[PDB]
Amino acid sequence: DYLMKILTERGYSFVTTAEREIVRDIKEKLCYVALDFENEMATAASSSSLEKSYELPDGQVITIGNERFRCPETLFQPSFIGMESAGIHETTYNSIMKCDIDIRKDLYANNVMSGGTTMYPGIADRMQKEITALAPSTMKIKIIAPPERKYSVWIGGSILASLSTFQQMWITKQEYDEAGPSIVHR
Amino acid sequence: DEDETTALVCDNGSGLVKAGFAGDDAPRAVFPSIVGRPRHQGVMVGMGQKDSYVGDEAQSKRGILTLKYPIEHGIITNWDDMEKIWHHTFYNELRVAPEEHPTLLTEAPLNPKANREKMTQIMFETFNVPAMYVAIQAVLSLYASGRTTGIVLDSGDGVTHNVPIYEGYALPHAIMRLDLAGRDLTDYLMKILTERGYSFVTTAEREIVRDIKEKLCYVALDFENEMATAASSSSLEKSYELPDGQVITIGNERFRCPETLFQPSFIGMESAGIHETTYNSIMKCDIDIRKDLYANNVMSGGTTMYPGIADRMQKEITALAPSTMKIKIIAPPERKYSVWIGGSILASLSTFQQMWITKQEYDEAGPSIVHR
Amino acid sequence: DEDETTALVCDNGSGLVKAGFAGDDAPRAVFPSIVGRPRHQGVMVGMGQKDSYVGDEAQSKRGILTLKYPIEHGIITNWDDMEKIWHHTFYNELRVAPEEHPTLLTEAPLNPKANREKMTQIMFETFNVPAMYVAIQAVLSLYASGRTTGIVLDSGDGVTHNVPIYEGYALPHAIMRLDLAGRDLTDYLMKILTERGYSFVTTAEREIVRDIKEKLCYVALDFENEMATAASSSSLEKSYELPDGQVITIGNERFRCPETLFQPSFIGMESAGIHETTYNSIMKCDIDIRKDLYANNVMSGGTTMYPGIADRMQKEITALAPSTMKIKIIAPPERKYSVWIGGSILASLSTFQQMWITKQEYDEAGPSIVHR
Amino acid sequence: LKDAQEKLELAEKKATDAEADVASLNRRIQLVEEELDRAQERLATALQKLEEAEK
Amino acid sequence: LKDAQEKLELAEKKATDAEADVASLNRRIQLVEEELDRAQERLATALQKLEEAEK
């Protein structure tokens, strides 16, 4: 919805519902998370061959040069959208300085990313450098972002549930009819 | 060989166990004297439910267990948890079966008669060792430095002691115990280092203050004009790099921590300090033996390893002792294992065989037999 | 009168400043300990450009400023921003000129020597007060309850402390600090109340969770069979009406919030809790003074105001203390200002005049003079 | 004698401070040399993975 | 005296052998630490070049 506005704001109109829906397909296909989002706006201005035109349901070739990355810069700067909360990288970090001390080297070398919105290319490099520069230099940072990440959650379940050792954690109707919903609740 | 190879030496401490085979030069096994009990039900991946944890697995997993120390101030306080540390020592650490190995154990200076009988009851009746023997710790330290008369200042993790020994017999009425040791000392550094403007916040910050104490701490001689030196600010300072980059600097406090051993007043202790106590032990002994004790102050224990401890003690007791006297502070390099090494020597010795308490002695005389 | 009227008492906290004239019964000025710095350039209608905001104007305008807290856990962490809060206190809140008023200030329990010297440097050298004095907070709380020996459990917005005091001298080595207080407590209620199925979404929802905590929260004795009671669902429930109609109900969580002070485990804290800590302070003190401390547990601080705090503490330490002992938990009604009132009394006192540090003492002895 | 013995606690003090710093610096060199075969080894692999992906 | 002075030429001898070995090992650690920022730096660049080419 933020891309929507920076794209109407680029001088456009997503007027019919066939215009609305495809802004989301623009976000998925053409959006980027640039590292050094600073001198990427600066780059935008010199106007390189950074621009990118998408052809709509019909001919209406829409161009998106710059906004292309202004959309995922929202994940590091919530201020782009009137959010006062902290952003993704700071939050990774704050989670970490809320944990036990002895476990913080582990968490830092194992930042696993999952979810459809973490798929924006260069998300991992920006996060890599975002937390290196907040973490004590004695630390090893490591941002794992696998390719199938839009289904990590599911795949982890597929593995686990097809596993040889999981059989003994399944809550059966025997457990339930005998223990009430409490049984699976743990 | 039957038992030349076969004698075990287990030194039970307040912080660490030291263990291994009589014959070796140093302990085969060194590990914390803890027994962890899980606060919640659950498992590690691939393991079963564990009722208990001992040594380093208890330390490493401390966040989900309630940790307990079986030996308070050198004395065994919980016998259920001690039999657990012994079990771990034989079966996992040294991986031996105990029922075919003679076992030399150690006890503390004025260890209650009843305890020496109880660990004998547990050694012979629940571990079924062939034979065993309990040596007093200061006595093994002395002996490992070759001699038989001297006074040992022994200082580890929970206790400090002075045990005057004459031709092998530790002198009961002259022994002094000071309950301030390396454990107390790590916690005081902790505060003078947070007080230097720092934070040992996570458990990976806590643990390493102890590794700062061991690596960088000093016992300065003329601790007076060492503070004075600190102020002119020489290249006396010392920065340590933490688990990460966070380079912490310790200049001065570096020696303010072992000055606690001479001044217990640094920590709200009203007791006298190490050097005075060495001395008081000595003016509590027979008169004719006091020149001997003075020329044979043997030091042992992890907390007596702070460099320049010996020079400070040297000058501390010269200046309290009558000038007609010869002072001599022996501090060997292996001193964090003196006790153990003295046991290794003694138990591998050719003449010790006839002092081993055998199951024959026990099944026939009751725990009284080894108690002496 | 010269200074009978004229002595100021400023108690600097982690959340609130309490200020006023020695002589008064309660603080003339109470306000947040913040300093706001505008995130953007612009003005309010009729005012000029303001570089900074302090107290309530910083809270009210928080959406356009970056708020900062000068006192972290009772210790002054930013001296540029603290001199700003003092300036505001004298000139705007109390509207006095400081250069003709003696100023009694307070510091925290183990406040670094260097800080007590720095706020003296700023009091005398940038505010030019005639004379000043720094009292320790627990010590003023005790004294305001008449006595001179007791142990204060002091708990405000960022820190909790236990300060055992004997004939006026706070006992350094027995003091305990627990970094969980009313601030931590409002944020935990927040979650158990959103977790009750709610949303404190706008900033007018956030702020009032704190007013729920103050008005409706309880410390139940037998917190065990109070949860059990919750379930049978008695008329224990309590609905509060929000800025608008939106009547929110809080039955149970009402006491789950102060049970955090006895169980830090409710919030992922591994530290011990208030009552155990009262006790541990006490078994760290001299033996002969422990009956005194036990019959004089004085409570002070905003977070010790939760009703039934005293009864729970009463029974919490009776059942840890040797039965030969008399337990006595004093919790006065004005306790959210004990500290301040103790300062008002002391500084208006007839005998205190001879302890004021004057510019004569300072210009002649350096900051060292007041440091003691 | 006071002079030979005093010259001494100072030469033995210096000997032990220098043995302590050499032990520390040798431990640090072994750790940075071991961080190495590791940095350089995953390197031969990362650069090989690049030439294959570029192809 | 003969014993304090003899203990001496030996403690001073040991002090100088240890100061010589620490100087050598510290020179070796600085060279292997400097081969490093270099191995690891071209690494951050080779791995970045991979993530961009793979993208």
DSSP A22-34: HHHHHHHHH----
**What CA–CA distance (Å, rounded) separates B295 from B304?**
18
D20 touches chain E (CB under 8 A): no
Taking CB atoms and an 8 Å limit, are A122 and E48 in contact across chains? Answer: no
**What CA–CA distance (Å, rounded) separates C11 from C2?**
22
Contacts with D10 from chain B: Cβ below 8 Å:
none
Single-letter amino acid, residue D35: E
Which residues, at least 6 apart from C349, have a Cβ–Cβ distance to it below 8 Å?
Answer: none
DSSP letters, B288-336, are TTHHHHHT-EEEESGGGGSTTHHHHHHHHHHTTS-TTSPP-EE--TTGG
The number of angstroms, rounded, from the C-alpha of B297 to the middle of its chain's C-alpha atoms is 17
**What CA–CA distance (Å, rounded) separates B240 from C73?**
27
Reported resolution, Å: 35.0
- Asked whether the beta carbons of B122 and B267 are under 8 A apart, the reply is no
- Asked whether the beta carbons of B202 and A101 are under 8 A apart, the reply is yes
- Asked whether the beta carbons of C176 and C277 are under 8 A apart, the reply is yes
Q: What is the dihedral of CA B70, B76, B77, B80, to 10 degrees?
A: 60
Q: Which of D11, D21, D35 sits opposite E8 (nearest CB)?
A: D11
Count of positions (residues) in chain D: 55
Helices then strands, counting H and E runs in chain A, come out as 11, 4
Taking CB atoms and an 8 Å limit, are A101 and B246 in contact across chains? Answer: no
Task: Classify strands C35-38 and C65-68 as parallel, antiparallel or unpaired.
Answer: antiparallel
Closest approach of D39 to chain E, Cα-based (Å): 6
Contacts with D9 from chain B: Cβ below 8 Å:
221, 311
Other C-beta atoms closer than 10 Å to the C-beta of B146 total 11
Taking CB atoms and an 8 Å limit, are E25 and D21 in contact across chains? Answer: no
**What CA–CA distance (Å, rounded) separates B191 from B253?**
10
- Asked whether the beta carbons of B193 and B200 are under 8 A apart, the reply is yes
- Asked whether the beta carbons of C288 and C238 are under 8 A apart, the reply is no
Closest approach of B32 to chain D, Cα-based (Å): 24
Contacts with B307 from chain D: Cβ below 8 Å:
16-17, 20
Q: Which of B215, B221, B307 sits opposite D16 (nearest CB)?
A: B307
Between helix A88-96 and helix A123-132 the angle, nearest 10°, is: 50
The number of angstroms, rounded, from the C-alpha of E8 to the middle of its chain's C-alpha atoms is 30
Residues facing B155 on adjacent strands: B160
Residue of D nearest to B314 (CA): D9
Q: How many alpha carbons lie under 13 Å from residue D17 in its C-beta half-sphere? A: 12
Alpha-helical segments (H) within D1-55: 2-54
E4 touches chain D (CB under 8 A): yes
Q: How many alpha carbons lie under 13 Å from residue C164 in its C-beta half-sphere? A: 24
Other C-beta atoms closer than 10 Å to the C-beta of A2 total 15
**What CA–CA distance (Å, rounded) separates C106 from C114?**
15
Which residues, at least 6 apart from C162, have a Cβ–Cβ distance to it below 8 Å?
Answer: C151, C152, C153, C154, C174, C175, C176, C277, C278, C281
Contacts with B201 from chain A: Cβ below 8 Å:
101
Contacts with A139 from chain B: Cβ below 8 Å:
243-245
Q: Which of C110, C173, C270 sits opposite B268 (nearest CB)?
A: C173
Closest approach of E17 to chain A, Cα-based (Å): 33
Tokens 């085969």: give the residue: B28
At residue E16, the 3 state secondary structure works out as helix
Structure-token pair, residue C78: 């930013």
**What CA–CA distance (Å, rounded) separates B317 from B282?**
11
Contacts with A137 from chain B: Cβ below 8 Å:
244-246
What Rg, from alpha-carbon coordinates, does chain E have?
Answer: 24
CB burial of residue B296 (10 Å; 0-12, 13-18, 19+): buried
Edge-to-edge strands of the sheet including B53-54?
B53-54, B35-38, B65-68
**What CA–CA distance (Å, rounded) separates C363 from C369?**
10
What Rg, from alpha-carbon coordinates, does chain C have?
Answer: 22
Distances (CA, A) of A27 to A1, A83, A119: 10, 20, 11
- Asked whether the beta carbons of C62 and C30 are under 8 A apart, the reply is no
Tokens 């005057």: give the residue: B164
**What CA–CA distance (Å, rounded) separates B237 from B250?**
6
**What CA–CA distance (Å, rounded) separates B3 from A3?**
81
C299-338 burial, b for 16+ CB within 10 Å, e for fewer?
bbbbbbbbeebbebbbebbeebbeeeeebebbbbeebbbb
D27 touches chain E (CB under 8 A): no
Which residues, at least 6 apart from C292, have a Cβ–Cβ distance to it below 8 Å?
Answer: C149, C150, C166
**What CA–CA distance (Å, rounded) separates A161 from A153?**
12
- Asked whether the beta carbons of B18 and B26 are under 8 A apart, the reply is no
Single-letter amino acid, residue A140: K
Q: What is the dihedral of CA B43, B49, B51, B53, to 10 degrees?
A: -50
Tokens 């309490």: give the residue: C18
- Asked whether the beta carbons of B153 and B160 are under 8 A apart, the reply is yes
Structure-token pair, residue A109: 């070398």
Contacts with B267 from chain C: Cβ below 8 Å:
173
**What CA–CA distance (Å, rounded) separates B54 from B31?**
9
Fill in the DSSP letter of residue B243. Answer: S
Torsions phi, psi of C330, nearest 5? -90, 125
The number of angstroms, rounded, from the C-alpha of A87 to the middle of its chain's C-alpha atoms is 11
Closest approach of E23 to chain A, Cα-based (Å): 26
**Touching subunits for chain B (3+ Cβ pairs under 8 A):** A, C, D
E37 touches chain A (CB under 8 A): no
**What CA–CA distance (Å, rounded) separates B126 from C69?**
62
Residue of B nearest to A138 (CA): B244
**What CA–CA distance (Å, rounded) separates C44 from A17?**
43
- Asked whether the beta carbons of A118 and A149 are under 8 A apart, the reply is yes
Closest approach of B326 to chain D, Cα-based (Å): 15
Task: Classify strands C160-166 and C150-155 as parallel, antiparallel or unpaired.
Answer: antiparallel
Structure-token pair, residue A18: 């066939």
DSSP letters, C15-53, are SEEEEEEBTBSS-SEEEE--EEEESS----TTPPP-S-E
- Technique employed here was cryo-EM
Single-letter amino acid, residue B351: T
Which residue pairs from B233-242 have beta carbons closer than 8 angstroms and sit at least 24 positions apart in sequence? B240/B212, B240/B215, B240/B216, B241/A138, B242/A136, B242/A138, B242/B205, B242/B208
CB burial of residue A182 (10 Å; 0-12, 13-18, 19+): exposed
**What CA–CA distance (Å, rounded) separates B69 from B73?**
10
Contacts with B246 from chain A: Cβ below 8 Å:
136-138
**What CA–CA distance (Å, rounded) separates C125 from C117?**
12
